[PDB]
Amino acid sequence: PGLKQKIVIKVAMEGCRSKAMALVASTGGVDSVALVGDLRDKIEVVGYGIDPIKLISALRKKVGDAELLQVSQA
Amino acid sequence: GPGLKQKIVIKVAMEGCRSKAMALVASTGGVDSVALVGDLRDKIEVVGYGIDPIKLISALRKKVGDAELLQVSQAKED
Amino acid sequence: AIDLSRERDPNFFDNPGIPVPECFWFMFKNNVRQDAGTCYSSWKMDMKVGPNWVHIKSDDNCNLSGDFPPGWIVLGKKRPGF
Ligand SMILES: [Cl-]
């Protein structure tokens, strides 16, 4: 269940791109993860029933900084 | 450089698994994206550069479960 | 009888940093749909078709060709708006 979600996160990443990607890709509800922007400094997450609050707090716990740029129905 | 992106598609066996597979694949050097695709949502499409598909399959088989390489192609960037 | 007009679209993901592939492909064994995905027009890909790797070429109208094993085929069609 759920409407399809698109979430875009700006991540610090300085050692950590692989770590952010692994953590986001392991998250429940996630169908796709992609690095976006020319500098691959944003993560686009798409899927169903993803909790963006836990995701952001888990990314901050393990990669330092993480901001939501977008949450929308995809 | 003018080097084309890779597209690799891997079928993963399912259990309590697709999530561990996605995490392992996403953690690999040069990966731009991972997506669960296919009629049964049991295939991972990976896009990136400098990915060794044989080493990736071995890694998956070792740390997650059975996996079969289904596609290796290049992105048409022309 | 294989009829692509009656096949549901594949489950796909377009990577945003590379051009959108113009074709859907559908893989059949004895006319039973096995799976489906996307591929570029006027291009090529290596795909496992049953037991064999097959070099599959696409023309400008998503017609696919290759040395498919007996019983197997991969067919292409243009995605909407392409
Ligand atoms: Cl292709």
Residue numbers in the entry:
A (entry chain A): 185 to 199, 202 to 260
B (entry chain B): 184 to 199, 202 to 263
C (entry chain C): 32 to 113
From the manuscript:
Intracellular nucleotide binding, leucine-rich repeat (NLR) receptors are key components of plant innate immunity pathways. The Pikp NLR allele only responds to the effector variant AVR-PikD, but the Pikm allele responds to AVR-PikD, AVR-PikE, and AVR-PikA. Here, we graft an interface from Pikm onto Pikp by mutating two residues in Pikp (Asn261Lys, Lys262Glu), forming PikpNK-KE.
To this end, we determined the crystal structures of Pikp-HMANK-KE bound to AVR-PikD, and to AVR-PikE. Each complex was crystallized and X-ray diffraction data were collected at the Diamond Light Source (Oxford, UK) to 1.6 Å and 1.85 Å resolution, respectively. A key interaction at interface 3, one of the previously defined Pik-HMA–AVR-Pik interfaces, involves a lysine residue (Lys262 in Pikp and Pikm) that forms intimate contacts within a pocket on the effector surface. In the PikpNK-KE mutant, the position of this key lysine is shifted one residue to the N-terminus compared to that in the wild-type, so that it occupies the same position in the PikpNK-KE sequence as in the Pikm sequence. We therefore conclude that the effects of the PikpNK-KE mutant on protein function are mediated by altered interactions at interface 3.
